[PDB]
Curated annotation (Swiss-Prot), chains A, B:
Gene3D superfamilies tied to this protein: Plant lipid-transfer and hydrophobic proteins
PTM comment: The disulfide bonds are essential for the inhibitor activity.
Subunit: Homodimer.
Superkingdom per UniProt: Eukaryota
Disulfide bridge partners, by residue number: 2-48, 16-37, 24-70, 38-86, 50-102
Protein name per the record: Alpha-amylase inhibitor 0.19
Annotated SMART domains: AAI
Source organism of this protein record: Triticum aestivum (Wheat)
Tissue: Endosperm.
CDD domains registered for this protein in UniProt: AAI_SS
Compartment(s) of residence: Secreted
Sorted UniProt keywords: Allergen, Alpha-amylase inhibitor, Disulfide bond, Secreted
Length: 111, 111
């Protein structure tokens, strides 16, 4: 498993929270804020990148709205594909199947 | 409405079909095939970009498997965020609410 606090820093992905708040209502995202988020994702292993994003999303909602001018549905869809916009692959599960997209995050707060 | 054949060329987004097949199992995507997909998306209006993507995905499934080594769930999640990886905004509905992500495509074959 990907243990919060060691597979990835907690609070998870500080650089990616400002990215998600811009993206979820279609604002323009500066290159620097995209770059910093992706650099932070890059350091986490392929196996744990979706876990870090799940933790981040859960933290934002549990602190909280957490996402001004953003719809619930598009928020969790945007968080689930940040790793795609970074062109960072993830491994879907124990098979080693790869993808660019986090389905567990897209189904938050369940999967 | 976005009419197939006039809001966008049909078959929809030829250049994006190879992108989606690489992405949906986490393969490396060449800059040329990303570029050509985004170029095609860029020409479609903010209002019809998700419609072009829905049409493309539907065609791929209706011709068909359509996605070798890809899971159903990650396929439609990947198609829903091709517009995010291109940094192209869409309008979510009649409100004019913006986003980078197509929720109707993520819910295929329903929404």
């Amino acid at each position: 498993m990907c243990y919060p606090g060691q597979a990835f820093q907690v609070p998870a992905l500080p650089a990616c929270r400002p990215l998600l708040r811009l993206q979820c209502n279609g604002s323009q995202v500066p290159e620097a804020v995209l770059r910093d988020c992706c650099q932070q994702l890059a350091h986490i292993s392929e196996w744990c990148r979706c876990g870090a994003l799940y933790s981040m999303l859960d933290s934002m909602y549990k602190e909280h709205g957490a996402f001004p001018r953003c719809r619930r549905e598009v928020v969790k869809l945007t968080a689930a594909s940040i790793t795609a916009v970074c062109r960072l692959p993830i491994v879907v599960d124990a098979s080693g199947d790869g993808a660019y997209v986090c389905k567990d995050v897209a189904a938050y707060p369940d999967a």
